[PDB]
Design a protein around this ligand. Structure first.
Ligand SMILES: C[C@@H](Oc1cc(-c2cnn(C3CCNCC3)c2)cnc1N)c1c(Cl)ccc(F)c1Cl
Length: 289
């Protein structure tokens, strides 16, 4: 049970650009495809029948939470890139929290996809995916949008095997709680093993800290979904990194790709490549395959 007139009126305007009428949407509450802190994700169809993922915000009880979340996430509607997850719309209803409607990604997240033993993606496949992520990160960077949680678990694969950078905006949530820790300066749950050393030190996230995360993401690809720093405690990641230590070369990571990875983790944020640079670099590496 959530009210409409209780929100900032400018936000209600923005949301109404992308409103879905309950009549247009069927949600299958028996078909859970994800569980987040804010709510579950379900199979749904938007009618002309589009298969979608429906994110419930029903664990957000309070209106001040909903407003803040919608305010921060609504910018998602003004993004359009084939390597960025789009927003189909927000279904507002008279009783219950707003439902966030997204395109259904048939192959789920990149991490579970590449970990599936029947899939056995080749080095070429894996580099391909990585290049697709860099392209969507390039777009977001150009919009001055800082992701804050770039990771393989947060990039989706559609039915055409197009990678969509996700878990941002109205989709934002922790869908794998194993990888978020309160052992950081902010005190709140953060993906510490994906975060730039400076972000751990200063609490600030930037496009250049997203590049650091992209480096970790590439490493996840080449390892086919191994968890980074398995013997480093969340208590220790900052000092591990301060000591100049880094994720080691995956067995089937080509040397130029590891080189790229090391550049992404340069202690000096100004020294790391742009996503523009990363696209060119990985594209050339891709082309050797
Ligand atoms: C909000 C939710 O969105 C989707 C999940 C899924 C999804 C999850 N799993 N699967 C299937 C593939 C593997 N086996 C279970 C079903 C599809 C598809 N499309 C989505 N838009 C989501 C989840 Cl659950 C996890 C990470 C994300 F970045 C996002 Cl954005």
């Amino acid at each position: 049970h959530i009210d409409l007139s209780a929100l900032n009126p400018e936000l209600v305007q923005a949301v109404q650009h992308v409103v879905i009428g309950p009549s247009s949407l069927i949600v299958h509450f028996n078909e859970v495809i994800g569980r987040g802190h804010f709510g579950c994700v379900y199979h749904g169809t938007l009618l002309k029948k589009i298969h979608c993922a429906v994110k419930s915000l029903n664990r957000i009880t309070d209106i001040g939470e909903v407003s803040q979340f919608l305010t921060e996430g609504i910018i998602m509607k003004d993004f359009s890139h084939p390597n960025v997850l789009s927003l189909l719309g927000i279904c507002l209803r008279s009783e219950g929290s707003p439902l966030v409607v997204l395109p259904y990604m048939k192959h789920g997240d990149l991490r579970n996809f590449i970990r599936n033993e029947t899939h056995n993606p080749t080095v070429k496949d894996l580099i391909g995916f990585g290049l697709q992520v860099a392209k969507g990160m390039k777009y977001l960077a150009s919009k001055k949008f800082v992701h804050r949680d770039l990771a393989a678990r947060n990039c989706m694969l559609d039915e055409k095997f197009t990678v969509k950078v996700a878990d941002f905006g109205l989709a934002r949530d922790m869908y794998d709680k194993e990888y978020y820790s309160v052992h950081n300066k902010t005190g709140a749950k953060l993906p510490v093993k994906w975060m730039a050393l400076e972000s751990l030190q200063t609490q600030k996230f930037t496009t250049k800290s997203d590049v650091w995360s992209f480096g970790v993401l590439l490493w996840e690809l080449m390892t086919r979904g191994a968890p980074p720093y398995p013997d480093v405690n969340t208590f220790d990641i900052t000092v591990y990194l301060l000591q100049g230590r880094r994720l080691l070369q995956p067995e089937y990571c080509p040397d130029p790709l590891y080189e790229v990875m090391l550049k992404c983790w340069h202690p000096k944020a100004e020294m790391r490549p742009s996503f523009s640079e990363l696209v060119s670099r990985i594209s050339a590496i891709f082309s050797t395959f």
